[PDB]
mmCIF file of C-alpha atoms and ligand atoms in Angstrom:
data_model
loop_
_atom_site.group_PDB
_atom_site.id
_atom_site.type_symbol
_atom_site.label_atom_id
_atom_site.label_comp_id
_atom_site.label_asym_id
_atom_site.label_seq_id
_atom_site.Cartn_x
_atom_site.Cartn_y
_atom_site.Cartn_z
ATOM 1 C CA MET A 1 -35.511 -21.943 65.785
ATOM 2 C CA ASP A 2 -33.518 -18.800 65.392
ATOM 3 C CA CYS A 3 -32.443 -17.655 61.954
ATOM 4 C CA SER A 4 -28.709 -17.655 61.251
ATOM 5 C CA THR A 5 -27.036 -14.525 62.658
ATOM 6 C CA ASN A 6 -23.924 -13.897 60.685
ATOM 7 C CA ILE A 7 -25.649 -13.031 57.476
ATOM 8 C CA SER A 8 -24.827 -9.874 55.440
ATOM 9 C CA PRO A 9 -25.000 -9.195 51.668
ATOM 10 C CA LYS A 10 -21.838 -9.628 49.606
ATOM 11 C CA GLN A 11 -20.694 -6.034 48.766
ATOM 12 C CA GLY A 12 -19.750 -5.233 45.240
ATOM 13 C CA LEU A 13 -22.450 -7.445 43.712
ATOM 14 C CA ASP A 14 -24.051 -6.064 40.544
ATOM 15 C CA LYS A 15 -27.753 -5.853 41.279
ATOM 16 C CA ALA A 16 -28.408 -6.306 37.558
ATOM 17 C CA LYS A 17 -27.224 -9.875 37.857
ATOM 18 C CA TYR A 18 -29.589 -10.665 40.774
ATOM 19 C CA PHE A 19 -32.698 -8.823 39.483
ATOM 20 C CA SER A 20 -32.397 -10.809 36.192
ATOM 21 C CA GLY A 21 -34.507 -13.550 34.537
ATOM 22 C CA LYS A 22 -36.131 -15.947 36.963
ATOM 23 C CA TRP A 23 -34.638 -18.190 39.551
ATOM 24 C CA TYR A 24 -35.107 -21.879 40.235
ATOM 25 C CA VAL A 25 -33.877 -23.355 43.530
ATOM 26 C CA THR A 26 -31.451 -26.190 42.770
ATOM 27 C CA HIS A 27 -30.437 -26.846 46.368
ATOM 28 C CA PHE A 28 -31.724 -25.828 49.782
ATOM 29 C CA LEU A 29 -30.449 -26.077 53.293
ATOM 30 C CA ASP A 30 -33.109 -26.051 56.023
ATOM 31 C CA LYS A 31 -31.818 -25.776 59.595
ATOM 32 C CA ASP A 32 -35.043 -27.057 61.116
ATOM 33 C CA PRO A 33 -38.109 -27.947 59.144
ATOM 34 C CA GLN A 34 -41.377 -27.811 61.129
ATOM 35 C CA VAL A 35 -43.000 -29.852 58.315
ATOM 36 C CA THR A 36 -41.079 -32.802 56.724
ATOM 37 C CA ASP A 37 -42.569 -32.023 53.316
ATOM 38 C CA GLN A 38 -39.987 -30.904 50.837
ATOM 39 C CA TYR A 39 -40.603 -28.067 48.405
ATOM 40 C CA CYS A 40 -39.402 -26.801 45.085
ATOM 41 C CA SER A 41 -39.425 -23.046 44.446
ATOM 42 C CA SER A 42 -39.007 -20.531 41.689
ATOM 43 C CA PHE A 43 -39.327 -16.765 41.820
ATOM 44 C CA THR A 44 -38.837 -13.611 39.719
ATOM 45 C CA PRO A 45 -37.344 -10.644 41.542
ATOM 46 C CA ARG A 46 -37.390 -7.103 40.169
ATOM 47 C CA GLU A 47 -36.201 -3.849 41.650
ATOM 48 C CA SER A 48 -36.954 -0.195 41.014
ATOM 49 C CA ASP A 49 -35.791 2.746 43.116
ATOM 50 C CA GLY A 50 -34.875 0.527 46.033
ATOM 51 C CA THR A 51 -38.216 -1.239 46.065
ATOM 52 C CA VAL A 52 -38.198 -4.993 45.348
ATOM 53 C CA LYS A 53 -41.282 -6.850 44.015
ATOM 54 C CA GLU A 54 -41.189 -10.554 43.388
ATOM 55 C CA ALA A 55 -43.541 -13.292 42.266
ATOM 56 C CA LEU A 56 -42.911 -16.403 44.337
ATOM 57 C CA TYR A 57 -43.955 -20.037 43.758
ATOM 58 C CA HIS A 58 -43.724 -23.101 45.983
ATOM 59 C CA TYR A 59 -44.415 -26.678 44.997
ATOM 60 C CA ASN A 60 -44.967 -29.271 47.727
ATOM 61 C CA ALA A 61 -43.174 -32.281 46.362
ATOM 62 C CA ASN A 62 -44.942 -34.756 48.688
ATOM 63 C CA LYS A 63 -48.507 -33.563 48.143
ATOM 64 C CA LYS A 64 -47.970 -32.313 44.604
ATOM 65 C CA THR A 65 -49.734 -28.966 45.195
ATOM 66 C CA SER A 66 -48.498 -25.451 44.769
ATOM 67 C CA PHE A 67 -48.974 -22.068 46.428
ATOM 68 C CA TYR A 68 -48.251 -18.517 45.352
ATOM 69 C CA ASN A 69 -47.122 -15.244 46.842
ATOM 70 C CA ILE A 70 -46.012 -11.716 45.905
ATOM 71 C CA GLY A 71 -43.281 -10.168 48.064
ATOM 72 C CA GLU A 72 -42.541 -6.443 48.425
ATOM 73 C CA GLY A 73 -39.803 -4.762 50.375
ATOM 74 C CA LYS A 74 -37.104 -2.140 50.432
ATOM 75 C CA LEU A 75 -33.402 -2.680 49.903
ATOM 76 C CA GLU A 76 -31.283 -2.034 52.974
ATOM 77 C CA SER A 77 -28.493 0.478 53.023
ATOM 78 C CA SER A 78 -26.136 -2.553 53.297
ATOM 79 C CA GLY A 79 -26.511 -3.821 49.692
ATOM 80 C CA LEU A 80 -28.580 -6.616 48.246
ATOM 81 C CA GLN A 81 -30.674 -7.454 51.230
ATOM 82 C CA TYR A 82 -34.337 -6.802 51.773
ATOM 83 C CA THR A 83 -37.150 -7.436 54.192
ATOM 84 C CA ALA A 84 -40.377 -8.174 52.317
ATOM 85 C CA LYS A 85 -43.991 -8.389 53.390
ATOM 86 C CA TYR A 86 -45.988 -10.610 51.123
ATOM 87 C CA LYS A 87 -49.374 -11.085 49.534
ATOM 88 C CA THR A 88 -50.953 -14.503 49.250
ATOM 89 C CA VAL A 89 -52.346 -15.027 45.691
ATOM 90 C CA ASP A 90 -53.944 -17.676 43.432
ATOM 91 C CA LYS A 91 -52.324 -18.920 40.260
ATOM 92 C CA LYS A 92 -53.754 -15.930 38.329
ATOM 93 C CA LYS A 93 -52.310 -13.476 40.897
ATOM 94 C CA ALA A 94 -55.684 -12.587 42.414
ATOM 95 C CA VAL A 95 -55.128 -11.490 46.009
ATOM 96 C CA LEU A 96 -56.319 -13.893 48.674
ATOM 97 C CA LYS A 97 -54.548 -11.954 51.565
ATOM 98 C CA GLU A 98 -52.727 -8.589 51.406
ATOM 99 C CA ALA A 99 -49.291 -8.021 52.937
ATOM 100 C CA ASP A 100 -49.593 -7.442 56.705
ATOM 101 C CA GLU A 101 -47.211 -6.018 59.239
ATOM 102 C CA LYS A 102 -46.460 -9.108 61.383
ATOM 103 C CA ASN A 103 -45.401 -11.627 58.591
ATOM 104 C CA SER A 104 -42.147 -10.963 56.606
ATOM 105 C CA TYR A 105 -39.023 -12.497 55.169
ATOM 106 C CA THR A 106 -35.555 -11.200 54.865
ATOM 107 C CA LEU A 107 -33.604 -12.236 51.803
ATOM 108 C CA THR A 108 -29.825 -11.694 51.722
ATOM 109 C CA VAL A 109 -27.847 -12.184 48.502
ATOM 110 C CA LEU A 110 -24.500 -13.907 49.282
ATOM 111 C CA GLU A 111 -23.404 -14.332 45.634
ATOM 112 C CA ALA A 112 -24.821 -13.677 42.172
ATOM 113 C CA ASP A 113 -23.268 -14.080 38.764
ATOM 114 C CA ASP A 114 -24.515 -14.435 35.196
ATOM 115 C CA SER A 115 -26.013 -17.923 35.755
ATOM 116 C CA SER A 116 -26.405 -18.590 39.436
ATOM 117 C CA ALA A 117 -26.894 -17.188 42.918
ATOM 118 C CA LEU A 118 -26.702 -18.067 46.616
ATOM 119 C CA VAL A 119 -29.245 -16.445 48.959
ATOM 120 C CA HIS A 120 -30.293 -16.774 52.562
ATOM 121 C CA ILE A 121 -33.955 -16.331 53.600
ATOM 122 C CA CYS A 122 -35.261 -15.860 57.129
ATOM 123 C CA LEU A 123 -39.071 -16.107 57.506
ATOM 124 C CA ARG A 124 -40.655 -14.472 60.531
ATOM 125 C CA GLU A 125 -44.074 -14.047 62.070
ATOM 126 C CA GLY A 126 -44.417 -11.552 64.873
ATOM 127 C CA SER A 127 -41.738 -12.077 67.452
ATOM 128 C CA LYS A 128 -40.738 -15.497 66.123
ATOM 129 C CA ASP A 129 -38.338 -16.662 63.491
ATOM 130 C CA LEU A 130 -40.197 -19.432 61.593
ATOM 131 C CA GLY A 131 -37.478 -20.751 59.385
ATOM 132 C CA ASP A 132 -34.096 -20.161 57.906
ATOM 133 C CA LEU A 133 -32.980 -21.429 54.455
ATOM 134 C CA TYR A 134 -29.971 -21.131 52.231
ATOM 135 C CA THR A 135 -30.865 -21.623 48.582
ATOM 136 C CA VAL A 136 -28.682 -22.107 45.482
ATOM 137 C CA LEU A 137 -30.388 -20.591 42.455
ATOM 138 C CA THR A 138 -29.994 -21.027 38.669
ATOM 139 C CA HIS A 139 -31.818 -19.402 35.753
ATOM 140 C CA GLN A 140 -33.098 -22.653 34.237
ATOM 141 C CA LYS A 141 -34.554 -25.744 35.833
ATOM 142 C CA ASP A 142 -31.761 -28.170 36.805
ATOM 143 C CA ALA A 143 -28.948 -26.024 35.313
ATOM 144 C CA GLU A 144 -25.607 -26.588 37.059
ATOM 145 C CA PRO A 145 -24.657 -23.917 39.607
ATOM 146 C CA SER A 146 -21.533 -21.982 38.738
ATOM 147 C CA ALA A 147 -18.163 -22.618 40.330
ATOM 148 C CA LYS A 148 -18.346 -19.116 41.836
ATOM 149 C CA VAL A 149 -21.611 -19.974 43.632
ATOM 150 C CA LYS A 150 -20.319 -23.373 44.771
ATOM 151 C CA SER A 151 -17.319 -21.556 46.235
ATOM 152 C CA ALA A 152 -19.756 -19.102 47.989
ATOM 153 C CA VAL A 153 -21.391 -22.118 49.654
ATOM 154 C CA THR A 154 -18.023 -23.283 51.042
ATOM 155 C CA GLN A 155 -17.160 -19.728 52.124
ATOM 156 C CA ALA A 156 -20.491 -19.388 53.939
ATOM 157 C CA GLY A 157 -19.229 -22.354 56.128
ATOM 158 C CA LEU A 158 -21.577 -24.865 54.527
ATOM 159 C CA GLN A 159 -21.310 -28.146 52.623
ATOM 160 C CA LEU A 160 -23.279 -28.228 49.374
ATOM 161 C CA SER A 161 -23.659 -32.021 49.784
ATOM 162 C CA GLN A 162 -25.752 -31.477 52.912
ATOM 163 C CA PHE A 163 -28.297 -29.402 50.949
ATOM 164 C CA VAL A 164 -31.357 -31.141 49.554
ATOM 165 C CA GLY A 165 -31.003 -31.186 45.712
ATOM 166 C CA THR A 166 -34.370 -30.433 44.216
ATOM 167 C CA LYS A 167 -33.714 -32.360 40.950
ATOM 168 C CA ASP A 168 -34.760 -35.575 42.700
ATOM 169 C CA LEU A 169 -38.002 -34.287 44.106
ATOM 170 C CA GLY A 170 -39.980 -34.426 40.873
ATOM 171 C CA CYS A 171 -40.569 -30.703 40.885
ATOM 172 C CA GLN A 172 -43.294 -29.102 38.840
ATOM 173 C CA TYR A 173 -43.065 -25.385 37.992
ATOM 174 C CA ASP A 174 -45.571 -22.841 36.834
ATOM 175 C CA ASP A 175 -43.560 -20.791 34.374
ATOM 176 C CA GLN A 176 -46.596 -18.810 33.379
ATOM 177 C CA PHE A 177 -46.956 -17.513 36.946
ATOM 178 C CA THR A 178 -43.301 -16.460 37.155
ATOM 179 C CA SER A 179 -43.103 -14.999 33.633
ATOM 180 C CA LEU A 180 -43.198 -11.242 34.341
HETATM 181 C C1 HEM B 1 -36.741 -25.059 47.700
HETATM 182 C C2 HEM B 1 -36.792 -23.879 48.365
HETATM 183 C C3 HEM B 1 -37.776 -23.575 49.470
HETATM 184 C C4 HEM B 1 -38.306 -24.390 50.396
HETATM 185 C C5 HEM B 1 -37.848 -25.786 50.624
HETATM 186 C C6 HEM B 1 -39.249 -23.647 51.185
HETATM 187 C C7 HEM B 1 -39.949 -24.146 52.240
HETATM 188 C C8 HEM B 1 -41.005 -23.455 52.774
HETATM 189 C C9 HEM B 1 -41.961 -24.041 53.685
HETATM 190 C C10 HEM B 1 -41.831 -25.448 54.249
HETATM 191 C C11 HEM B 1 -42.892 -23.152 53.964
HETATM 192 C C12 HEM B 1 -44.088 -23.407 54.898
HETATM 193 C C13 HEM B 1 -45.318 -23.741 54.037
HETATM 194 C C14 HEM B 1 -46.522 -23.923 54.964
HETATM 195 O O1 HEM B 1 -46.650 -24.915 55.721
HETATM 196 O O2 HEM B 1 -47.369 -23.042 54.969
HETATM 197 C C15 HEM B 1 -42.568 -21.963 53.221
HETATM 198 C C16 HEM B 1 -43.254 -20.786 53.247
HETATM 199 C C17 HEM B 1 -42.789 -19.604 52.776
HETATM 200 N N1 HEM B 1 -41.673 -19.407 51.980
HETATM 201 FE FE1 HEM B 1 -40.460 -20.854 51.321
HETATM 202 N N2 HEM B 1 -39.260 -22.338 50.698
HETATM 203 C C18 HEM B 1 -38.378 -22.245 49.618
HETATM 204 C C19 HEM B 1 -38.100 -21.119 48.893
HETATM 205 C C20 HEM B 1 -38.553 -19.880 49.209
HETATM 206 C C21 HEM B 1 -38.073 -18.626 48.645
HETATM 207 C C22 HEM B 1 -37.054 -18.600 47.523
HETATM 208 C C23 HEM B 1 -38.730 -17.637 49.206
HETATM 209 C C24 HEM B 1 -38.633 -16.111 49.005
HETATM 210 C C25 HEM B 1 -38.036 -15.554 47.987
HETATM 211 C C26 HEM B 1 -39.612 -18.196 50.196
HETATM 212 C C27 HEM B 1 -40.515 -17.485 50.960
HETATM 213 C C28 HEM B 1 -41.488 -18.057 51.708
HETATM 214 C C29 HEM B 1 -42.649 -17.327 52.254
HETATM 215 C C30 HEM B 1 -42.980 -15.835 52.192
HETATM 216 C C31 HEM B 1 -43.459 -18.346 52.946
HETATM 217 C C32 HEM B 1 -44.755 -18.054 53.711
HETATM 218 C C33 HEM B 1 -45.930 -18.408 52.835
HETATM 219 C C34 HEM B 1 -47.226 -18.364 53.651
HETATM 220 O O3 HEM B 1 -47.286 -18.218 54.913
HETATM 221 O O4 HEM B 1 -48.251 -18.455 52.980
HETATM 222 N N3 HEM B 1 -39.490 -19.543 50.179
HETATM 223 N N4 HEM B 1 -41.452 -22.208 52.459
#
């Protein structure tokens, strides 16, 4: 299930707006889920000298469990786009597995403003694309995405209505994990 091809970062985006606060996923669009479980997610991206580090949380809304990761990658020469390898961690950020060289994700920022963002994530393992997602992001749980980001969704060729809205899933977040 190939990741979407025509994906490049929006040029002219202020990186200070993207590497800002934390993000909560309000809406996600999954091309082809392998599992039918639905997730909520929040993460806290930071950048220094072209290196991105981010604390990542997933909550399985069906099973009511959560898992944790730390991503690390370099910004491309193209703008706000990065391929990250990732550690697997417990809730206290103790390392369970270190980043390896065959598992990565590529995150492309399509829009970002003071309240909201739209990003695309392709997850890979070895020679295979595992999964492609678009995600609408806000800085507080269940905040409304901005008009600018809703327009970004339409301009990406998508319909926001076809995304899964996470409000309905009964998400639980770990704001301690994502603080810092
Ligand atoms: C609501 C939004 C999201 C959904 C629905 C979602 C869905 C998924 C699913 C279904 C998996 C597979 C879990 C498994 O069976 O092991 C997964 C793993 C993963 N996701 Fe997400 N995801 C979301 C947000 C994010 C974001 C924002 C990022 C990166 C910034 C991300 C990065 C990853 C990574 C690195 C893995 C691999 C974890 C592992 O192998 O341990 N995801 N996600």
